[PDB]
Every structure is written in structure tokens, then in C-alpha cells.
Amino acid sequence: ATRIAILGAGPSGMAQLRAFQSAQEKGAEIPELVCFEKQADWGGQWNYTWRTGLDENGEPVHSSMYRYLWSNGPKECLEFADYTFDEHFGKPIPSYPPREVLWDYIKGRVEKAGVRKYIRFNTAVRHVEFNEDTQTFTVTVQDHTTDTIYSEEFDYVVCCTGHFSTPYVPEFEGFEKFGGRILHAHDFRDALEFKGKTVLLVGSSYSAEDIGSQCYKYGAKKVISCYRTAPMGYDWPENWDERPNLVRVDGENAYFADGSSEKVDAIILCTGYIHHFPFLNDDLRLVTDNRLWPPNLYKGVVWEDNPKFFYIGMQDQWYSFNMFDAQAWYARDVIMGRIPLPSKEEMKADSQAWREREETLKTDEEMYDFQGDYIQDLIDMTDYPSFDIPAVNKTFKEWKHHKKENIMTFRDHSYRSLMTGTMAPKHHTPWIDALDDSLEAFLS
Amino acid sequence: MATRIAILGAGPSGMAQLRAFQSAQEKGAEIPELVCFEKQADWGGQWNYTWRTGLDENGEPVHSSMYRYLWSNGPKECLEFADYTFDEHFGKPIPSYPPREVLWDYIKGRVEKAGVRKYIRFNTAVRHVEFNEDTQTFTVTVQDHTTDTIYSEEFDYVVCCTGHFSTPYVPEFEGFEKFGGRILHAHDFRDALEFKGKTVLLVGSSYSAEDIGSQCYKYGAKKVISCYRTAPMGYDWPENWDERPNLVRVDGENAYFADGSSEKVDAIILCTGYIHHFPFLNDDLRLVTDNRLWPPNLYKGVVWEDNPKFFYIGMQDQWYSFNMFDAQAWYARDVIMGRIPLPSKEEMKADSQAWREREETLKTDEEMYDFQGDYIQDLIDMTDYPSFDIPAVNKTFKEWKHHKKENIMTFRDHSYRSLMTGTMAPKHHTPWIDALDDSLEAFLSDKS
Ligand SMILES: Cc1cc2nc3c(=O)[nH]c(=O)nc-3n(C[C@H](O)[C@H](O)[C@H](O)COP(=O)(O)OP(=O)(O)OC[C@H]3O[C@@H](n4cnc5c(N)ncnc54)[C@H](O)[C@@H]3O)c2cc1C
Ligand SMILES: Cc1cc2nc3c(=O)[nH]c(=O)nc-3n(C[C@H](O)[C@H](O)[C@H](O)COP(=O)(O)OP(=O)(O)OC[C@H]3O[C@@H](n4cnc5c(N)ncnc54)[C@H](O)[C@@H]3O)c2cc1C
Ligand SMILES: NC(=O)c1ccc[n+]([C@@H]2O[C@H](COP(=O)([O-])OP(=O)(O)OC[C@H]3O[C@@H](n4cnc5c(N)ncnc54)[C@H](OP(=O)(O)O)[C@@H]3O)[C@@H](O)[C@H]2O)c1
Ligand SMILES: NC(=O)c1ccc[n+]([C@@H]2O[C@H](COP(=O)([O-])OP(=O)(O)OC[C@H]3O[C@@H](n4cnc5c(N)ncnc54)[C@H](OP(=O)(O)O)[C@@H]3O)[C@@H](O)[C@H]2O)c1
Ligand SMILES: [Cl-]
Ligand SMILES: [Cl-]
Numbered sequence: 001a002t003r004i005a006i007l008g009a010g011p012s013g014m015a016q017l018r019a020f021q022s023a024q025e026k027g028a029e030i031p032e033l034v035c036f037e038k039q040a041d042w043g044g045q046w047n048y049t050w051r052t053g054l055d056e057n058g059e060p061v062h063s064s065m066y067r068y069l070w071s072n073g074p075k076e077c078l079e080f081a082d083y084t085f086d087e088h089f090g091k092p093i094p095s096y097p098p099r100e101v102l103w104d105y106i107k108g109r110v111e112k113a114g115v116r117k118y119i120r121f122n123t124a125v126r127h128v129e130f131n132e133d134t135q136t137f138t139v140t141v142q143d144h145t146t147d148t149i150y151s152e153e154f155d156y157v158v159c160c161t162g163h164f165s166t167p168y169v170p171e172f173e174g175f176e177k178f179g180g181r182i183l184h185a186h187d188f189r190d191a192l193e194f195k196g197k198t199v200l201l202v203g204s205s206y207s208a209e210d211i212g213s214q215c216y217k218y219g220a221k222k223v224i225s226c227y228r229t230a231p232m233g234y235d236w237p238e239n240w241d242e243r244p245n246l247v248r249v250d251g252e253n254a255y256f257a258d259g260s261s262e263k264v265d266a267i268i269l270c271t272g273y274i275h276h277f278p279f280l281n282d283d284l285r286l287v288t289d290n291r292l293w294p295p296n297l298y299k300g301v302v303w304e305d306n307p308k309f310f311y312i313g314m315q316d317q318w319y320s321f322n323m324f325d326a327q328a329w330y331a332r333d334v335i336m337g338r339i340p341l342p343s344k345e346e347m348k349a350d351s352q353a354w355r356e357r358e359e360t361l362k363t364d365e366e367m368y369d370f371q372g373d374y375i376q377d378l379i380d381m382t383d384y385p386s387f388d389i390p391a392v393n394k395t396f397k398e399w400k401h402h403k404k405e406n407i408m409t410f411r412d413h414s415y416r417s418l419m420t421g422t423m424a425p426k427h428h429t430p431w432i433d434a435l436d437d438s439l440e441a442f443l444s
Numbered sequence: 445m446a447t448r449i450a451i452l453g454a455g456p457s458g459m460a461q462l463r464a465f466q467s468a469q470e471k472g473a474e475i476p477e478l479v480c481f482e483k484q485a486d487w488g489g490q491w492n493y494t495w496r497t498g499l500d501e502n503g504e505p506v507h508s509s510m511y512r513y514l515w516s517n518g519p520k521e522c523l524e525f526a527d528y529t530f531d532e533h534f535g536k537p538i539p540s541y542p543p544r545e546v547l548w549d550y551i552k553g554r555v556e557k558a559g560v561r562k563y564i565r566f567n568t569a570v571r572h573v574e575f576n577e578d579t580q581t582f583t584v585t586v587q588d589h590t591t592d593t594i595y596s597e598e599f600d601y602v603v604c605c606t607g608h609f610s611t612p613y614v615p616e617f618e619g620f621e622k623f624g625g626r627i628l629h630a631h632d633f634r635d636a637l638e639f640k641g642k643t644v645l646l647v648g649s650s651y652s653a654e655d656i657g658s659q660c661y662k663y664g665a666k667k668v669i670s671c672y673r674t675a676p677m678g679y680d681w682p683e684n685w686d687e688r689p690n691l692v693r694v695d696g697e698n699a700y701f702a703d704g705s706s707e708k709v710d711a712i713i714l715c716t717g718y719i720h721h722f723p724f725l726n727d728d729l730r731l732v733t734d735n736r737l738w739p740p741n742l743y744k745g746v747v748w749e750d751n752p753k754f755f756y757i758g759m760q761d762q763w764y765s766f767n768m769f770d771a772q773a774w775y776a777r778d779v780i781m782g783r784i785p786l787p788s789k790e791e792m793k794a795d796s797q798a799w800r801e802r803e804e805t806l807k808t809d810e811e812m813y814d815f816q817g818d819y820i821q822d823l824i825d826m827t828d829y830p831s832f833d834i835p836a837v838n839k840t841f842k843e844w845k846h847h848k849k850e851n852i853m854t855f856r857d858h859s860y861r862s863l864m865t866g867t868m869a870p871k872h873h874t875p876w877i878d879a880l881d882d883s884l885e886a887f888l889s890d891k892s
Contacts, residue, residue, distance in 0.1 A: 050620045050627055053498030054505055058611040058721040126723060127572060142723060149727050166503040175495045179637040182495055192624040276503040278571060278587060282594050
């Protein structure tokens with residue numbers, strides 16, 4: 001029979017397994033599935049580790065998530081259309097859950113599906129090669145439980161390895177002289193390490209916003225964020241300064257493009273990530289900056305030069321979980337021969353139309369509107385449950401409004417489920433005072 | 445020549461392998477085409493310092509484990525090249541325990557003189573090495589991070605020089621997920637100043653624990669705790685350094701030891717050693733071993749017995765370092781060039797097994813560096829690598845061990861004689877404990 005390799009058991013790989021299991025329970029014959037995951041358990045980013053740098057096997061540490069992390073968007077925007085918050089939790093819960101609560105949710109769906117049996121944990125993907133002679137892929141992996149490098153042949157491969165794990169880590173003048181810690185956002189674990197300290201954040205996006213907010217919340221003496229082009233422009237607290245870009249450091253001080261300088265204890269590079277696929281040769285390897293429309297992907301998923309190779313979740317994310325579902329359902333239907341692909345020329349013409357639109361986008365609203373339209377096109381082609389994308393866009397609009405009103409209280413707001421219409425209750429504690437990140441403390 | 449060699453890495457071992465070939469060429473031999481792949485932007489391996497930790501600018505694991513303020517942990521006289529002396533490089537006597545930048549300068553000096561930088565492709569990560577039975581050649585696949593290109597080339601021989609002190613052994617202890625302080629491996633340690641006024645727990649009882657603890661002490665840590673798995677280090681530690689039996693668990697703030705004691709600690713540094721990790725090799729070529737004086741499956745400690753066109757340099761545990769890699773690289777060179785015909789697989793395994801049986805009996809430090817000295821003597825007797833006085837190096841290791849026992853904080857204040865030139869090292873202008881500036885300029889200057 002047909003054999004599929006699914007690379008990774010984060011949200012995307014979980015979605016890909018669930019997509020196949022959904023087709024099976026509706027009565028379809030599905031291919032043999034094998035999912036390779038280098039971590040010891042599923043959940044991808046959402047599987048928290050104290051580890052940084054390299055794991056116990058020598059593999060790069062995957063997760064970038066830290067203690068005290070909460071949902072940075074409304075949970076109502078990432079709800080599964082086939083497995084609601086109401087089904088999983090059995091009651092209304094607040095709109096910005098801590099990491100452990102969303103990890104519990106995503107695991108709940110695949111626990112229900114029974115798809116853990118397809119997953120080989122502690123197994124790092126080493127190489128994927130396409131064989132023209134057999135029209136099959138050789139997937140080579142390292143099983144760290146047995147310390148064995150082995151290969152198997154697959155008919156199709158679905159890459160679900162994420163793109164927020166391999167850091168973009170630029171050097172600044174004087175880093176070799178600096179007496180304090182220099183780390184990337186990827187390595188950040190515990191805001192308590194920076195209690196009573198002066199922390200410099202290099203960058204102006206989600207990691208700078210939230211790591212700065214955690215350092216503030218857990219008692220940093222001072223936060224400095226520095227921007228390359230434009231300030232973040234939010235209402236920062238009194239002990240948070242925004243500066244133009246870092247120019248250089250010395251033993252103790254950071255020097256900014258405005259000619260100012262001051263003592264800093266630690267530097268956190270919130271400079272984003274690279275798309276990194278060392279297990280792919282250039283015939284299969286996606287090369288892209290982080291963007292809403294990466295190139296060479298028909299419907300954002302099908303590798304145009306070899307359409308038996310698929311990528312899930314490689315777009316920049318406003319939508320996250322239910323985008324990966326729409327993609328996984330699409331990829332499943334292509335694999336199962338339910339969606340015949342057009343010619344390479346027709347695929348490229350379709351992708352180019354989406355690219356041309358992506359190139360014009362300016363505002364946050366234009367961006368989540370584009371991604372909503374993309375997902376609508378995907379769900380129109382499969383049996384993934386329809387959901388109210390314009391209502392989700394309106395929720396993103398409210399969220400963006402709440403961040404502008406007050407960047408420290410946006411998580412104190414509640415939104416309505418677009419799947420069930422359930423209104424989220426207000427949490428028992430305002431975010432700034434909610435020090436305990438535990439599922440037990442949140443659901444109490 | 446019509447054959448081509450891939451050398452994986454441009455640390456001391458890969459530099460030695462290039463120098464071995466260049467030495468044969470300047471003496472009038474025809475040598476093979478050489479290609480050396482190095483993922484860093486410059487040569488030196490461990491000795492090339494970086495502020496970076498975890499993953500580098502290209503997403504490759506950061507290689508170097510070296511830190512600010514690192515000095516030679518053995519006498520430089522024990523690692524001197526037999527073909528390129530300290531006297532030749534520096535033009536004067538220098539003290540016996542140079543800072544990192546000074547030994548980096550030295551190792552670079554030899555390959556600068558040799559002109560072998562032209563063979564090296566920097567910023568290039570080795571991804572895969574496969575042996576092809578059909579052509580009896582290796583396909584080496586690499587990622588050139590300068591151009592972001594993955595390409596493959598065919599090689600007749602491969603010499604693996606990628607080290608084994610870079611991929612950390614990082615065991616989890618009960619409660620690590622709860623602990624509110626930093627947890628890092630020795631591999632990630634960069635700057636003792638980060639621990640000034642802090643209580644630092646070191647897990648481990650070998651060189652990394654000794655030296656990282658010594659740096660934390662020197663640069664003003666409040667307290668050092670070192671914990672041992674089997675036996676204490678047993679040195680004369682300063683008053684703010686405690687030795688405990690092994691860590692059992694941690695909570696939010698405290699470390700709990702096997703003696704039933706516990707105390708609040710600010711940071712935990714795992715000084716738990718390293719793993720031999722070769723993700724670019726399939727199991728037919730991949731060395732699997734613990735850190736030891738005699739890793740298995742290596743004839744003369746260098747020739748992969750299942751495929752003797754594949755070689756490993758420097759994969760042994762190290763008393764000897766630079767001149768061991770030279771002895772090995774000269775041997776591998778002579779096998780590649782057909783100067784040393786190999787015995788049958790059965791004869792190679794019988795020779796390796798004799799060395800293994802001896803290795804298994806070793807107990808004392810002296811038995812260990814004596815074994816490694818005898819190993820190196822066997823290698824150098826088979827090639828034109830300049831003979832050097834191995835018993836005199838062993839005697840220097842013995843003096844060094846004696847100096848560490850007398851006073852672990854002042855062993856670096858002693859001087860030894862070059863076994864290559866007979867030059868006596870002068871006393872440094874500053875005692876180690878007060879020598880806060882690690883720069884080559886500060887070390888080679890005359891002012892204290
Ligand atoms: C710090 C951080 C916070 C975030 N917070 C939110 C949030 O609040 N809300 C939200 O909607 N989204 C958030 N995201 C976005 C995040 O990308 C998605 O939520 C989701 O985790 C992406 O799922 P994925 O499966 O595509 O990738 P990942 O979650 O990265 O999972 C990829 C999986 O592939 C495995 N893998 C990778 N390489 C290999 C290999 N070679 N061999 C084997 N296995 C491999 C990994 O170990 C991992 O399990 C956050 C991202 C980051 C980095
Ligand atoms: C912290 C520390 C301190 C030390 N101090 C001393 C000392 O004072 N005295 C002493 O004698 N010895 C010391 N050593 C021992 C050390 O092993 C040797 O000095 C020497 O650096 C070993 O050289 P090598 O070339 O075998 O390996 P390395 O120095 O580790 O060099 C390996 C090279 O391979 C490259 N490489 C690795 N993987 C790849 C890949 N996939 N693709 C491409 N290139 C790759 C690396 O980037 C590097 O250039 C120390 C070791 C450590 C870890
Ligand atoms: N749940 C949470 O609270 C949380 C926390 C952290 C991250 N995340 C998630 O993680 C993902 C990644 O977010 P991210 O902000 O890490 O990455 P990102 O969105 O790709 O942000 C990249 C940032 O790096 C900056 N940058 C790049 N090079 C720079 C340089 N040389 N100097 C200064 N700044 C530089 C960019 O500035 P320019 O704009 O000038 O290019 C930009 O601000 C997102 O999905 C996010 O939601 C979530
Ligand atoms: N120039 C310098 O100053 C400097 C500094 C750092 C390192 N180095 C070099 O780096 C190399 C490696 O030295 P290293 O000490 O890092 O590694 P190493 O010699 O392999 O030592 C490993 C240590 O980890 C301990 N260990 C392993 N697992 C443990 C566990 N679960 N709990 C507690 N302890 C555990 C071992 O204890 P057991 O003995 O009980 O097994 C041993 O003490 C050497 O070449 C060294 O010279 C040099
Ligand atoms: Cl069907
Ligand atoms: Cl000012």
C-alpha cells in the first residue's frame with residue numbers, strides 16, 4: 001500500500017495525522033502513516049523544556065517557549081473547527097490560556113483520534129531524497145532510543161518541522177567584549193533570571209513585546225527595546241524605554257543610533273528565525289523569508305517542483321491551528337487522489353496570483369484578511385468543517401484594538417467562540433498579577 | 445594526484461592533516477587533491493572563541509566550548525609541535541600556561557607557514573558521507589552557508605576531524621523543570637562575570653568542573669559548589685568552594701545532594717562531559733564510543749576497521765593533544781599515500797584488541813598518560829614525523845599533576861622546559877589569580 005512520512009508531531013504534524021484519521025472514521029481506506037518526531041513527546045513549540053541549545057541526543061532544542069507564556073492572540077482565533085474548546089474543557093474558559101492549557105487542548109484532539117500509534121518519538125529526520133527511478137522518497141532518520149540510523153521508502157512526504165526554532169542571530173559590534181548574558185529569544189526560559197536586572201531586547205515584533213512584558217511582570221529593574229526601522233509604539237510602563245537600533249556594546253554598556261548609552265545586564269536578540277531544512281537537498285528545500293506567501297508552494301502547501309512533497313505551516317501566522325488543519329486536509333485530499341493537481345504551469349500561475357496580492361499588503365488588517373481568504377480557498381476544497389472566517393477577522397481586529405489601548409492588559413479581554421458561540425468568561429486574576437502559569441491555577 | 449581526500453574540520457586535527465600532506469609535498473612527494481570542510485568562518489576548532497552559544501548564525505550547533513579567561517590547562521611543553529616549536533613561532537621564551545588566544549596564534553602560525561588555508565572551505569557544514577560500493581568512493585554532501593547551496597562531491601578517502609568535546613552530555617536531574625535559575629552545560633559557559641556574586645553549582649568532577657569553578661572563584665562568584673558522582677576531586681579548594689556528593693534533585697531554588705544536605709543555588713553548570721556525535725555518518729562509518737583512551741573499531745586508533753578508506757583523528761580522550769593529532773595525521777597520510785600497506789581486517793582487529801586489553805587495565809593518571817605516550821610512539825615509529833622525547837613529556841605531566849595537588853589555584857604559576865628545544869619557560873609577570881586580562885597583548889607584554 002501507499003506510505004506517507006509526516007516530519008514532526010507539533011500542531012501541523014498532529015493536524016496531518018488527524019486529517020487522515022478523520023477520513024478513516026468517515027469510511028475511507030487511508031495510506032500507512034509514519035510520523036517522525038525528535039522530541040520525546042508531541043506538541044512541537046507547545047511542549048515546554050528547560051533545555052536550551054542542544055538536547056540530550058545532540059539535536060537542536062526545538063521549542064522557543066518559556067515559563068509564564070500565554071496565548072498571544074485570542075484562543076477563539078485558533079480553535080479547531082472539528083474539536084471545540086467546549087468539547088475539550090466541558091465549560092467556558094478565558095480567551096488567553098497559558099501554554100500548558102493550549103498544549104492540553106491540541107493533545108486532546110490527537111488522544112481522541114488514537115494517532116499516537118503512528119509516531120516514532122526520539123527520532124530525528126536526517127535526510128529526504130527523491131528517487132526518479134522509483135518515484136519514491138528515501139527518508140533517513142536517527143532513532144536515538146536505539147542509536148540507529150535507518151531509512152525507509154515513502155510515496156509522499158509532508159514536512160511539518162516549523163520555522164520558529166532555528167534562530168536568526170545577528171552579531172553587533174562589541175558582543176565579544178560584553179560581560180553580561182547574550183541569548184536569542186529561542187533560549188529565553190525564565191523571566192525570574194532577570195529579576196532586578198536591566199534587559200535589552202533587540203527587535204520590534206511579538207518576541208520583543210512579550211519577552212519584555214514577562215521581564216516587566218516578573219520584576220526586571222528596566223527593559224530597553226531597540227528597533228531597526230520603526231518603534232513598536234505601544235504604551236510601555238515607566239521602566240520600559242524604546243531606543244533606535246543598537247550600534248555596539250562594550251564591557252557593560254549598550255550604545256544606540258540616537259547617540260545614547262547605558263549599562264545593560266543582559267541582551268535578548270528578538271530577531272526572529274530562519275527556515276532551516278538541513279535534511280533536504282536543494283531539489284526539495286524551501287528557501288524563504290518569513291512571510292504570508294512563501295514561494296514554490298501551490299495552495300501554500302504543494303512543492304511545485306515535486307508535488308508528492310508537501311509543507312504545512314511554513315507561512316507567517318496570524319491564523320495558526322485552524323490554518324494548519326485547512327492545509328493538512330488539503331494535502332490529505334491531494335495524497336488520496338480526491339483533488340487532482342493541475343499542470344506545473346497552472347499551479348505556478350495560481351501561486352503567482354496569490355504572491356502578487358501578498359506583495360501589495362501594508363496594514364495588519366490587509367494581512368489577516370489575506371490569510372483568511374487563503375484558508376477559505378483551502379476549506380472550500382475539502383470536508384474540513386466550514387467556519388466563519390470574517391467573524392475571526394473581526395476578532396483579530398478587536399485584539400489589535402485591545403493591544404493599542406493598553407499593551408499590558410490586552411490579555412484581560414474576552415471574545416466569543418466562532419465555532420460554538422460560547423462567550424469566554426473574564427479570568428479570576430488580571431494578567432499582570434497571574435504569576436502561576438499552571439493549567440490547575442488557570443482552570444481553578 | 446588523481447585521488448582526492450575530504451578532511452572534515454579545520455581544528456587542530458584537520459590543520460594537522462593538511463600540514464601532514466603539505467610536509468610530504470614540500471619534501472618532493474606528489475600528494476592527492478585535498479578539500480577541507482569547516483562550518484566555522486575561521487580555523488582553530490575549539491580554540492576559535494565565540495560569544496555565541498547553542499546554534500550559530502547558520503543554524504549549525506555552536507562548536508567551541510571555550511570561554512573568556514581560558515588558559516592552557518596543561519603545560520604548553522606537553523602539546524608542542526615537533527616540526528614547529530614555540531621558539532620558532534614566538535621568537536622568545538614564554539610562560540608555560542598561555543591564554544587561549546596565544547595557543548590559537550601558535551596553531552594558526554604553523555598552517556599559515558604551510559600555506560594550507562587554500563584547501564579549506566569555511567562556512568561549510570558536512571551534512572552526509574556515504575560510501576558507494578559500486579565506485580569504491582565516498583559521496584560527501586555539504587551545505588555552503590555563504591551561498592546557501594547544498595552540493596555533493598566524490599572522494600577516494602575521508603578523514604574525520606570533527607572533535608568530541610562539542611556535543612554536550614546533558615543529563616536531566618529530578619526537578620530541573622521547576623528551577624528558577626540558569627541551567628547550562630559547560631559547553632555554553634562563556635563569561636565568569638555573569639556569575640559574579642552568585643552561588644554556582646557545578647555537576648561533575650573533571651577538568652570542566654575544576655576550571656569553570658576556578659574561573660567563577662577568580663571573577664568573584666559568592667560560592668562554588670562542585671558535586672561528584674563517584675569520588676571527590678580532593679584538591680585544596682578556597683574557603684567559598686564546597687565539594688558535595690552527587691546532585692539528587694532541585695526545586696524552585698534549592699539543590700539536594702546525596703548526603704541529605706540542600707542549599708539555595710543561583711545557577712547550575714553541567715560539567716558532565718560530551719558525546720561522540722556524527723549525524724553526517726550512516727552506521728556503516730559511524731564511531732560509537734564513550735570518551736576513553738582506546739575507542740573501538742579503530743586500527744592504530746585512526747583507521748576505521750570496517751572501511752579503511754575512512755579515518756578518524758583525535759577521537760581518543762586526551763592527555764596528549766596537538767602532537768598526538770600530528771602522529772595520527774602523519775600515519776593516516778602514509779596509509780592514504782600507500783606508504784603503509786594495511787594488514788587484513790582480521791590482523792587489524794587483532795592489533796586493536798591488544799591495545800584495548802591494555803587500556804582496560806589502566807587505573808592511575810600515570811598509567812593513562814604512559815599508555816597514550818606508548819600509543820603515540822608506535823605511530824611516530826611508522827612515519828617521518830620528527831621523533832620527540834615522550835618519556836620527558838610523561839615526566840612533565842607528572843610534575844603538572846604534582847603542582848595541581850600542592851595547590852590547585854597556583855599550578856599555572858609554574859614553568860617547564862621545552863622537550864623540543866630545551867628552552868626553559870620564564871615565570872609570567874602576573875600570578876594566575878590576579879591575571880584578569882586574557883589578551884595575547886597583555887600576556888606577551890612585559891608590564892604586570
Ligand atoms: C515562542 C512562540 C510562541 C508562540 N505562541 C503562539 C501563540 O500564543 N498562539 C499561536 O497561535 N501560535 C503561537 N506560536 C506559533 C507557532 O508556530 C504555532 O502555534 C505552532 O506551534 C506551529 O506548529 P507546527 O507544527 O507547524 O510547528 P512546531 O510547533 O515548531 O512543531 C514542529 C515539530 O517538528 C519537530 N521537528 C523539527 N525538526 C525535526 C527533525 N529534523 N526531525 C524530527 N522532528 C523534527 C519539532 O521537534 C516539533 O515537534 C508561537 C511560536 C513561538 C516560537
Ligand atoms: C573547553 C576546552 C578546553 C580545552 N583546553 C585544552 C588545553 O588547554 N590544552 C589542550 O591540549 N587541549 C585542550 N582541549 C582539548 C581539545 O580537544 C584540543 O585542544 C583540540 O581543540 C582538539 O582538536 P580537534 O581538531 O580534534 O577538534 P576540535 O578542536 O573540536 O575541532 C573540530 C573542528 O571540526 C569542525 N566541525 C565539526 N563538525 C563539523 C561539520 N559537521 N562540518 C564541518 N565542520 C565541522 C568544527 O567547527 C571545528 O573546526 C580543550 C577542549 C575543550 C572542550
Ligand atoms: N505567545 C507569545 O507570547 C509569543 C512570544 C514570542 C513569540 N511568539 C511567536 O513567535 C513567532 C515569531 O515572533 P518573533 O517576534 O520572534 O519573530 P518575527 O515576527 O519574525 O520578528 C522579527 C523581528 O526581528 C527584528 N530584527 C531582525 N533583524 C534585526 C536586527 N538586525 N536588528 C534589530 N531588529 C531586527 C525585526 O525588525 P524589522 O521589523 O525591522 O524587520 C522584527 O521586529 C510568532 O508567531 C509569535 O507570535 C509568541
Ligand atoms: N583549558 C581548560 O581550562 C579546560 C576547561 C574545560 C575543559 N577542558 C577540556 O575539555 C575536555 C573535557 O573535559 P570535561 O571535564 O568537560 O569532560 P570529561 O573529562 O569527560 O569529564 C566528565 C565529567 O562528568 C562527570 N559526569 C558524567 N555524568 C555525570 C552525572 N550524571 N552526574 C555527575 N557527574 C557526571 C564525570 O564523572 P565521573 O568521573 O564519575 O564519570 C566526569 O567528572 C578535556 O580535554 C579538558 O581538558 C579544558
Ligand atoms: Cl476516497
Ligand atoms: Cl538620553
